[PDB]
Design a protein around this motif. Structure first.
Motif, short mmCIF file in Angstrom:
data_model
loop_
_atom_site.label_atom_id
_atom_site.label_comp_id
_atom_site.label_asym_id
_atom_site.label_seq_id
_atom_site.Cartn_x
_atom_site.Cartn_y
_atom_site.Cartn_z
N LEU A 1 0.85 -1.18 0.00
CA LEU A 1 0.00 0.00 0.00
C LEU A 1 0.89 1.23 0.00
O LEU A 1 0.45 2.33 -0.35
CB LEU A 1 -0.90 0.00 1.23
CG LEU A 1 -1.93 -1.12 1.36
CD1 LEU A 1 -2.57 -1.09 2.73
CD2 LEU A 1 -2.98 -0.98 0.27
N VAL B 1 4.00 -0.88 4.30
CA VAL B 1 2.66 -1.20 4.75
C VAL B 1 2.00 -2.04 3.67
O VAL B 1 2.03 -1.70 2.49
CB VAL B 1 1.83 0.08 5.00
CG1 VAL B 1 0.44 -0.28 5.47
CG2 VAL B 1 2.52 0.96 6.04
N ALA C 1 -4.52 -3.77 7.45
CA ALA C 1 -3.30 -3.14 6.97
C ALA C 1 -2.16 -3.60 7.87
O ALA C 1 -2.29 -3.61 9.09
CB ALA C 1 -3.44 -1.64 7.02
N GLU D 1 -6.74 -1.83 11.49
CA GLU D 1 -7.96 -1.66 10.70
C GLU D 1 -7.58 -1.18 9.28
O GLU D 1 -6.84 -0.22 9.14
CB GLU D 1 -8.84 -0.63 11.40
CG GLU D 1 -10.20 -0.36 10.77
CD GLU D 1 -10.95 0.75 11.48
OE1 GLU D 1 -10.38 1.39 12.39
OE2 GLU D 1 -12.12 1.01 11.13
N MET E 1 -8.06 0.86 6.22
CA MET E 1 -8.78 2.07 5.83
C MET E 1 -8.68 2.26 4.33
O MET E 1 -7.80 2.96 3.83
CB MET E 1 -8.19 3.27 6.57
CG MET E 1 -8.24 3.14 8.10
SD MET E 1 -9.92 3.23 8.78
CE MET E 1 -10.55 1.64 8.39
N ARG F 1 -1.86 14.08 6.59
CA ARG F 1 -1.07 12.90 6.24
C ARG F 1 -1.21 11.78 7.27
O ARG F 1 -0.97 10.61 6.98
CB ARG F 1 0.41 13.28 6.08
CG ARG F 1 1.06 13.76 7.37
CD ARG F 1 2.56 14.06 7.22
NE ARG F 1 3.06 14.77 8.40
CZ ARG F 1 2.92 16.08 8.57
NH1 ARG F 1 2.32 16.82 7.65
NH2 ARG F 1 3.34 16.66 9.69
N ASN F 2 -1.60 12.14 8.49
CA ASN F 2 -1.68 11.17 9.58
C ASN F 2 -3.11 10.70 9.85
O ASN F 2 -3.37 9.98 10.81
CB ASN F 2 -1.08 11.77 10.84
CG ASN F 2 0.43 11.94 10.73
OD1 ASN F 2 1.10 11.16 10.05
ND2 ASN F 2 0.97 12.96 11.39
N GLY G 1 -4.64 7.95 12.31
CA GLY G 1 -4.10 6.65 11.98
C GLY G 1 -2.61 6.49 12.24
O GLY G 1 -2.07 5.40 12.07
N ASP G 2 -1.95 7.56 12.65
CA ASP G 2 -0.53 7.50 12.96
C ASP G 2 -0.26 8.25 14.25
O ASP G 2 -0.80 9.34 14.47
CB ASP G 2 0.30 8.13 11.83
CG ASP G 2 1.79 8.12 12.12
OD1 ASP G 2 2.26 8.97 12.91
OD2 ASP G 2 2.49 7.26 11.57
#
Ligand code: 5P8
Length: 294
Positions: free
Chosen positions: A30, A38, A48, A97, A99, A153-154, A169-170
């Motif tokens: 990804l 990833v 992921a 999860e 996304m 970006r996160n 997500g980060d």
């Protein structure tokens, strides 16, 4: 093995749900970019897969473990779930999860309204994303977790389509600080007291969310267009703020400018930010405003 404390409860690597390696299957890449790749995976649960490079240092290993601990301990719909880990085989995995909508920056840029897709995005779409993340930020705030790099970006989206949900997500910046140089610090997302005194509070994330709002309503532009990090630093330190993104409703820009108040005490908490986002979504003059077509 290092400990981790969140919401006053302590956890260790033993609390991580180890998923047996034979149950995990890589499907496709990804992306990689940062330290590690990833993959999309299956465990059938679709996931992921964040990987730890087998060629890494001790601090890389500890960083990897720590973010596994951090994410596994959150429980909120606007923060990406951790399905589990696979730390007992190499390369080590963190399972998240999936996304399918990808990161928010790429989404905004690729899904900009265009003469072909003149209506790919509406103001309500952006307001829903903003609400989603502000909700995640409120959860972090009320649990006294400071993210330190709230930025498009996160953030991730559950799906490309209209019912997409946005989530943080980060947590790699929070992880570093929990345990990089000047040029890598996200200074364009940072308030004056952060990059000057290194002071961080819940009001740090409020400022950053204001910048994220700008990212959202600009449809994915880099903040402070044409300015380097040091120019931004001096601009913001002197009272400078970004202009409204193109076509941005005034009520929305007002949330940004309130998030960007020099005194952290003058900046809203996320409860108030959510209230104002909600009020924007109710207001026909806001949501009937057309986004620019590239
Ligand atoms: C750790 C990684 O997590 C995920 C990535 C994706 C989906 N779900 C999760 N959990 C994803 C991405 N792009 N695409 C097309 C997909 C898909 N499907 C983004 N990406 C490559 C990232 O590395 C990345 C970027 C930001 C962030 F916050 C977390 C991540």
């Amino acid at each position: 093995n290092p400990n981790y404390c969140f919401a006053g409860k302590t956890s260790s690597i033993s609390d991580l749900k180890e998923v047996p390696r034979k149950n995990i299957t890589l499907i496709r890449g990804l992306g990689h970019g940062a330290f590690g790749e990833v993959y999309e995976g299956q465990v059938p649960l679709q996931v992921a897969v964040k990987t730890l490079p087998e060629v890494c240092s001790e601090q890389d290993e500890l960083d990897f473990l720590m973010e596994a601990l951090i994410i596994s301990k959150f429980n909120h719909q606007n923060i990406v779930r951790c399905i589990g880990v696979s730390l007992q085989s190499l390369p080590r995995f963190i399972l998240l999860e999936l996304m399918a909508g990808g990161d928010l920056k790429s989404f905004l840029r690729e899904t900009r309204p265009r003469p072909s897709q003149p209506s790919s995005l509406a103001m309500l779409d952006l307001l829903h994303v903003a609400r989603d993340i502000a909700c995640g930020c409120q959860y972090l705030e009320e649990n006294h977790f400071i993210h330190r790099d709230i930025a498009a970006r996160n953030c991730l989206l559950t799906c490309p389509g209209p019912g997409r949900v946005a989530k943080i997500g980060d947590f790699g910046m929070a992880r570093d600080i929990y345990r990089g140089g000047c040029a890598m610090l996200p200074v364009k997302w940072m308030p004056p007291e952060a990059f000057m005194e290194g002071i961080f509070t819940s009001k740090t994330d409020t400022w950053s969310f204001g910048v994220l709002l700008w990212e959202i309503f600009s449809l994915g532009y880099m903040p402070y267009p044409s300015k380097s990090n040091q120019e931004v630093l001096e601009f913001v330190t002197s009272g400078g703020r970004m202009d409204p993104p193109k076509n941005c409703p005034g009520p929305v820009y007002r949330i940004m400018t309130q998030c960007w108040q020099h005194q952290p005490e003058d900046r809203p908490n996320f409860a108030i930010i959510l209230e104002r986002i909600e009020y924007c979504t109710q207001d026909p003059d806001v949501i009937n405003t057309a986004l620019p077509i590239e």
